[PDB]
Structure 1
Amino acid sequence: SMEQVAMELRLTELTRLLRSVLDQLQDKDPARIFAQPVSLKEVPDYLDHIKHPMDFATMRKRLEAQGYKNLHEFEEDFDLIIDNCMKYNARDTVFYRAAVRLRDQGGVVLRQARREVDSIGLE
C-alpha cells in the first residue's frame, strides 16, 4: 500500500538522522572505550555483572537494519552504554570518567535531536 511506503520513508529518514546523531555521539568517545562490545576475554565475569551489554558497533548494526523505530529506542541503547560502564567500573577509573564525559557532551546532541525528530515528524 501507499501508506506502508510512506511509513517506510519516515523510518528511512529517521535512520538517516540517527546515523548523524550516532556519529556525533561517538566523536565524544575519542578513546574508543565504547566502540566495541566489552571483551569477555579481557573481562571474563562481565555478564555476571551486566545483564544487557551495549556498545557503538552493536548500535550501528541495529541502525543500518533500520531497527530503531523512534528516538526513545535509540536513547535507551545509548543510556545502556553509559549506565553499564558506571556500574562495572569505579569512579576513579578512566572508564567511568569517559562515560561521565560522554553522557554530559551527548546530552547536548540528543536535546537538539529530539527537536528535529518532533519538528520534522519522524516517528
Structure 2
Amino acid sequence: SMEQVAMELRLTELTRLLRSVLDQLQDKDPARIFAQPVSLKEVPDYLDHIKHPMDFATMRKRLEAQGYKNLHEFEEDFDLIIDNCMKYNARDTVFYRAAVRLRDQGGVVLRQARREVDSIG
C-alpha cells in the first residue's frame, strides 16, 4: 500500500537522524570503552551481574536493520550502556568515569534530537 511506503520512508528518515545521533554520541567515547560488547571470555561472570548488556556496535547493528521504531527505543539502549557500566564498575574506575562523561555530554545531543524528531514529525 502507499501508506506502508510512506511509513517506511519515515522510518528510513528516523534511521538517518539516529545514525547521526549515534555517531555524535560515540564521539563522546574517545577511549572506545563502549564500542564493543563486554567480552564474556575476558569477563566470564559479566552476565551474573548485568542482565541486558549493550554497546555501540550492537546498537549500530539494530540501527542499520532499521530496528529502532522511535527515539525512546534508541535512548533505552544508550541508557543501558551507561547504567550497566555504572553498576558493574566502581566509582573510582576509568570505566565508571567514562560512563558519567558520556551521559553528561550525550545529554546535549539527545536533547536536540528529541526536538528534531518531534518537529520533523
When normalised by structure 2's length, the TM-score is 1.00
Task: Tell me, in whole angstroms, the C-alpha distance in 2 between the residues paired with 1:14 and 1:41.
Answer: 35
Question: Could you list the per-position Cα deviations for residues 27-53 of structure 1 after superposition, in whole angstroms to 9, with x for gaps in the alignment?
Answer: 000000000000111111000000000
Query: Shift of the alpha carbon at 1:90?
Result: 0.1
Helix, strand or coil at the partner of 2:78: helix
**CA shift digits 1:41-84 (9 cap, x unpaired):** 11110000000000000000000000000000000000000000
Question: Partners in 2 of 1:99 and 1:42 — Cα distance?
Answer: 20
**Matching of residues 28-67 of structure 1 within 5 Å:** 28-67=28-67
1:3 aligns with 2:3: yes
Question: Gaps (5+ residues) in structure 1?
Answer: none
Structure 2 segments unaligned to the other structure (5+ residues): none
Misfit runs of 4+, over 3 Å: none
Equivalent residue pairs, number: 121
Distance 1:12 1:117 in 2: 13
Higher relative contact order (CA 8 A, sep 6+): 1
Superposed CA RMSD in Å reads 0.3
Q: 1:87 Cα deviation (Å)? A: 0.1
